[PDB]
């Protein structure tokens, strides 16, 4: 029916969802099977694999233009009807259409607003949008990305931003950032078989080396940018180091911590996702905000197939590592996340702890149910990866559904690119 | 059809075919996922019972490699007679044991299922009064407790008939601590149990008004008014909580009971409904250490522990809550191990569950699992289940929720 309730089991607040009635595409679940913990549950996309026919693209365009003109209290106005007819002609004569600046901004902000996996969405309407649709080469992509990084970093007072490159046309002329984030550290396969640096990035690191990058072969080597424009072969660029803000990790109590020689970068900037607005696909759309401390201290530092530094911290702390039941992993994990937050705050680099972020999200949910009739949210991703049940989102029921505009996953370009 | 599930830490990929056997709803639709809803969303007629019974008997005779046998066909014949004549039927003892074990094996929210086939089943279907239920439950507690070497067990009371004669254990668990709200708004004891404590006091219980009063059993036989019984205190094994490094921890006066024993769920086997079926295992430490002690609506001792730890409790970003939570959970595990009372830490348990899950995919074609419940309430991503994709679906026999009995019971006396 016309409503589904969600309950918080701590406060007994009940919210009533009607926004899900506007959901467009499949979650992957059914009556009989829930796919809520599948990373990529569904391949349901809104238009086929490349350049659609008119009957495929125009309905999606009309739906978005309708939604945008409703959003600004028109619908049916002179400009709405003209825009429809203008999109109609543009598709007739080019097989696609071009978004207005206002529509582009509306679409980007609503993709963030609709991102059910993102705990940071209370900030969704404060997003700086850089229109990079006039770009034609990898050199121009590099210039746009450098300006984004400089604006977003803002000497540590971080600012959310997205830079949007030309949309897909036929699928052979894609713009792509091959990096998964604008700033990541290299990972190196070692002679014995261990890994130096960040193990997630071993393959991408090897592509960069195989493209002519000379690796300094350290533990915190900022990877080059690997940029593809208009379907051509990708090109390597070194981000100027003065644009890459980094934080040395120290601990407020353990003076030995800084001798671990750890650091991390300040700017999280996802660059491998696809932005979908009214049937248009922006395959290069790097966006950035600021970290929740656990993203560094829990996942980046302590995943087994990542930096895996729990061993060292625990040793220096003189914990019993004979058996799991001493909870030495849990104890070192806390100290590391204390140190990360203390270090970012000491250097006045924007960062949020998982207690503050999750409390912000409960408040965001309440705002969204009050003004919008709902808020799509993926509990599996929203609950932080440590200390789950002492955060308020753990006890919050959530409904997950897919709204458009949206951010989507896309295949890695090196599986699909035909080299020249 | 097949569905694949991937582990993103190990890259292992498993193939689920067992989901084709599912039947009831998950609650999700093709366009909305309700995977984090706690409870998504009167007795069966003859026509409804026939196919439910058949499916169960079919699955039982398949499990014992007797499908299609003369004994299979005769059991089906016999079951349909009973349904036809009496509007219900009676499980054989073998079927009851198999059903009980498979409800556990099918419990998608339970991380402890590697143990599912070692379950001691106590058949209590001959019971007729609350005194009889008390006797059965006492024997269950004593067998399961086993002087600290805990053994999984379940006791199964008579099935529902017309819904007007249900057997129920009114307690949510066999052993729990009372909670008392004070006139000044504070709480003594376990805040989760305030409501049920009130019900007991009203039924005539004389409460000690301490921090760790074991609640009485409130037992309902054959739809009559429930009756109060005190579990003999020497059957309730308890563990005083101390910490291996903080000698002051013992001065918090904390203790917990050793036997976790859920008593408010419904066991469904072949369409038959067993509304009183208390079952018990042994604890994962975080059930006590994270939830029982550190939930805000529970004993809520993060404050005192962090205070005695001298933590900076002004800013959240000092992570004092996280730091104190770990120490409480260290204390819980150390205390049980010292007293040789069975317990498992969340690292050992999630590792065992991954091995169980993989074995289940191999021999059975899958393993329904609820990630939201399987991932422990602390240190999620440093356990192996966090990175394990899982499929959730409902197989029968199963354990289900049922309404609380004080909401539906119509009283008889005065
Ligand atoms: C401003 C501060 C922000 C914070 C604190 C934040 C927080 C987070 C966190 C913790 C995650 C989980 C990431 C992971 O565990 O891998 C996430 C995911 C995500 N965020 Fe945000 N975010 C912020 C800004 C943004 C912005 C500006 C956008 C887009 C314009 C965005 C879009 C997304 C998307 C699409 C995901 C899902 C990514 C995926 O599925 O891999 N976020 N966010
Ligand atoms: C033998 C040791 C066992 C361990 C270590 C164990 C562990 C757990 C844990 C940690 C949970 C989640 C509870 C929570 O966090 O609230 C759970 C749930 C559950 N367990 Fe097990 N369990 C064990 C035995 C059993 C047995 C013997 C049965 C039934 C015969 C059973 C059936 C269930 C069910 C039905 C649930 C879900 C309850 C609900 O949804 O409220 N478990 N178990
Ligand atoms: C709202 C949310 O579904 C709820 O808090 C769940 C989350 N996961 C859980 N997981 C376990 N093991 N036990 C619980 O009580 C809960 N509670
Ligand atoms: C299998 C599981 O869904 C997967 O590991 C998810 C779980 N939850 C997550 N949550 C966040 N925030 N980020 C992640 O990468 C993941 N990984
Ligand atoms: C914009 C943004 C802000 C933030 N604080 N965090 C993220 C996520 C960082 C990268 N995530 C790993 C993944 F690939 F899953 C996405 C993105
Ligand atoms: C048999 C069993 C063993 C164990 N170690 N733990 C439990 C769970 C205790 C209570 N659980 C909360 C709930 F209501 F969901 C059920 C049950
Ligand atoms: Zn679902």
Q: What is the DSSP string of B79-135?
A: HHHHHHHHSS----HHHHHHHHHHHHHT-TT-TTGGGTT--EEEE-TT--SHHHHHH
What's the Rg (C-alpha) of chain A? 23
Between chains, do B36 and A379 touch, taking CB under 8 Å as contact?
Answer: yes
Contact A312, A256 (CB under 8 A): no
Give the one of B29, B323, B377 whose C-beta lies nearest to A31's C-beta. B29
Q: In angstroms, what is the span from residue A299 Cα to ligand 2's centroid? A: 28
What is the spatial distance between Cα A86 and Cα A83, in angstroms, rounded to a whole number?
5
Measuring CA to CA, which residue among B163, B108, B168, B399 is closest to residue B266? B399
Measuring CA to CA, which residue among A395, A334, A335, A323 is closest to residue A359? A395
Start-end of H helices in B223-312: 285-286, 293-294, 302-308
Task: Determine the residue of chain B that is closest to A324 in CA distance.
Answer: B347
Q: Is residue B333 part of a domain?
A: yes
Q: In angstroms, what is the span from residue B163 Cα to ligand 1's centroid? A: 50
Mutate to test the interface with A, among B379, B384, B390 (most CBs of A within 10 A): B379
Ligand 1 pocket, A287 CB below 6 A? Answer: yes
Which stretch of DSSP H or E encloses residue A110?
Answer: helix A101-113
Contact B299, B281 (CB under 8 A): no
Provide, as residue numbers in chain A, all residues whose Cβ is less than 8 Å from the Cβ of B379.
329-330, 333, 386-387
Task: Determine the residue of chain A that is closest to B290 in CA distance.
Answer: A389
Q: Is residue A1 part of a domain?
A: no
Check whether residue B227 and residue B243 sit in a common domain. Answer: no
Provide, as residue numbers in chain B, all residues whose Cβ is less than 8 Å from the Cβ of A353.
316-317, 319
What is the total residue count of chain B?
Answer: 414
B262 three-state secondary structure: strand
**What is the DSSP secondary structure assignment for residue A397, as one 8-state letter?**
-
Contact A228, A176 (CB under 8 A): yes
**Resolution expressed in Å:** 2.0
Per the listing, tokens 């753990």 go with A394
**B386 is annotated as contributing to ligand binding:** yes
Check whether residue A149 and residue A100 sit in a common domain. Answer: no
Between chains, do A337 and B325 touch, taking CB under 8 Å as contact?
Answer: no
Contact A218, A227 (CB under 8 A): no
Q: Is residue A180 part of a domain?
A: yes
Q: Is residue B182 part of a domain?
A: yes
Check whether residue B132 and residue B95 sit in a common domain. Answer: no
Neighbours of ion ligand 7 (CB under 5 A): A 29, 34, 36; B 28, 33, 35
Ligand 5 pocket, A142 CB below 6 A? Answer: no
Check whether residue A166 and residue A198 sit in a common domain. Answer: no
Q: Is residue B2 part of a domain?
A: no
Q: Could you tell me what percentage of chain A is helix, strand and coil, using 3-state DSSP and rounding each to the nearest 5?
A: 40, 15, 45
Q: Mutation test of ligand 4: which of B381, B384, B385, B388 has the most ligand atoms closer than 8 Å to its C-beta? A: B381
Between chains, do A329 and B347 touch, taking CB under 8 Å as contact?
Answer: yes
Which stretch of DSSP H or E encloses residue A344?
Answer: helix A328-346
- Range(s) of the domain holding residue B251: 238-260+283-348
Check whether residue B175 and residue B307 sit in a common domain. Answer: no
Check whether residue A166 and residue A43 sit in a common domain. Answer: yes
Q: Is residue B394 part of a domain?
A: no
Measuring CA to CA, which residue among A283, A341, A301, A354 is closest to residue A185? A301
Measured by CA distance, the residue closest to atom 4 of ligand 6 is B283
Given the DSSP bridges, would you call strands B153-156 and B279-280 parallel, antiparallel or unpaired?
A: antiparallel
Check whether residue B93 and residue B131 sit in a common domain. Answer: no
Active site residue B9: no
Measuring CA to CA, which residue among A147, A388, A161 is closest to residue A290? A161
Q: In angstroms, what is the span from residue B360 Cα to ligand 3's centroid? A: 24
Check whether residue B220 and residue B326 sit in a common domain. Answer: no
Q: What are phi and psi of A106, to 5 degrees?
A: -55, -45
**A135 is annotated as contributing to ligand binding:** no
What is the spatial distance between Cα A47 and Cα A28, in angstroms, rounded to a whole number?
17
Token pair listed for B25: 């709803």
| Partners of residue B6 on adjacent β-strands | B13
Q: Is residue A399 part of a domain?
A: no
What is the spatial distance between Cα A67 and Cα A71, in angstroms, rounded to a whole number?
6
Contact B221, B132 (CB under 8 A): yes
What is Dmax (Cα atoms) for chain A?
Answer: 74
B100: left (phi over 0), alpha (psi -120 to 50) or beta: alpha
Count of domains observed in chain B: 3
Q: What are phi and psi of B294, to 5 degrees?
A: -120, -5
Q: Is residue B174 part of a domain?
A: yes
Provide, as residue numbers in chain A, all residues whose Cβ is less than 8 Å from the Cβ of B297.
10
Between chains, do A4 and B32 touch, taking CB under 8 Å as contact?
Answer: yes
Q: How many contacts does A have with B, using Cβ atoms within 8 A?
A: 205
Ligand 6 pocket, B293 CB below 6 A? Answer: no
Check whether residue B110 and residue B186 sit in a common domain. Answer: no
What is the spatial distance between Cα B60 and Cα B20, in angstroms, rounded to a whole number?
18
Check whether residue A184 and residue A139 sit in a common domain. Answer: yes
Q: Quick one: angle between helices A101-113 and A54-71, nearest 10?
A: 90
Check whether residue B118 and residue B181 sit in a common domain. Answer: no
Of the candidates A121, A168, A250, A402, the residue annotated as catalytic is A121
Q: Which method was it determined by?
A: X-ray
Check whether residue A155 and residue A279 sit in a common domain. Answer: no
Spatial neighbors of A407 by CB under 8 A, at least 6 apart, are A111, A112, A115, A273, A274, A275, A276, A285
Contact A241, A151 (CB under 8 A): no
B150: left (phi over 0), alpha (psi -120 to 50) or beta: beta
Name the minimum distance, in Å, from the CA of B34 to any CA of chain A.
6
Spatial neighbors of B315 by CB under 8 A, at least 6 apart, are none
């Amino acid at each position: 029916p016309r409503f589904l309730k969600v309950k918080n089991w701590e406060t007994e607040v009940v919210l009533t969802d009607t926004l899900h009635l506007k959901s467009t595409l499949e979650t992957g679940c059914t009556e009989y099977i829930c796919m809520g913990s599948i990373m990529h549950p569904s391949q349901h996309a809104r238009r086929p694999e490349d350049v659609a026919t008119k009957d495929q693209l125009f309905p999606l365009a009309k739906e978005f233009i309708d939604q945008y003109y409703s959003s600004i209290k028109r619908f049916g106005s002179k400009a709405h009807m003209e825009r429809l007819e203008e999109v109609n002609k543009e598709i007739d004569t080019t097989s696609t259409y071009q978004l207005k600046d206002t529509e582009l901004i509306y679409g980007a902000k609503h993709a963030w607003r609709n991102a059910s996996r993102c705990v940071g969405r209370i900030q969704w309407s404060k997003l700086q949008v850089f229109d990079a649709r006039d770009c034609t080469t990898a050199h121009g992509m590099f210039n746009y990305i450098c300006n984004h990084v400089k604006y977003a970093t803002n000497k540590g007072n971080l600012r959310s931003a997205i830079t949007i490159f030309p949309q897909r046309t036929d699928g052979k002329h894609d713009f792509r950032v091959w990096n998964s984030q604008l700033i990541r550290y290299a990972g190196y396969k070692q002679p014995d078989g261990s890994t130096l640096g960040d193990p997630a990035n071993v393959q991408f690191t090897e592509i960069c080396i195989q493209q002519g990058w000379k690796p300094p072969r350290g533990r915190f080597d900022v990877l080059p940018l690997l940029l593809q424009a208009n379907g051509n072969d990708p090109e390597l660029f070194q981000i100027p180091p003065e644009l890459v803000l980094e934080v040395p990790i120290r601990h407020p109590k353990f003076e030995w911590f800084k001798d671990l020689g750890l650091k991390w970068y300040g700017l999280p900037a996802v660059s491998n996702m696809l932005l979908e607005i009214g049937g248009l696909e922006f395959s290069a759309c790097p966006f950035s905000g600021w970290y929740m401390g656990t993203e560094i201290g829990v996942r980046d530092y302590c995943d087994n197939s990542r930096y895996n530094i729990l061993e060292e911290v625990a040793k220096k702390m003189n914990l019993d590592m004979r058996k799991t039941s001493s909870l030495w992993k849990d104890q070192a994990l806390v100290e590391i996340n204390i140190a990360v937050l203390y270090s970012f705050q000491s250097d006045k680099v924007t960062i949020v702890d998982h207690h503050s972020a999750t409390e912000s999200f409960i408040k965001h949910m309440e705002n969204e149910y009050r003004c919008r009739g709902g808020c799509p949210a993926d509990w599996v991703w929203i609950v932080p990866p440590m200390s789950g049940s002492i955060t308020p989102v753990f006890h919050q029921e959530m409904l997950n559904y897919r709204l458009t505009p949206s951010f989507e996953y896309q295949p890695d370009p090196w599986n699909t690119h035909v080299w020249k």
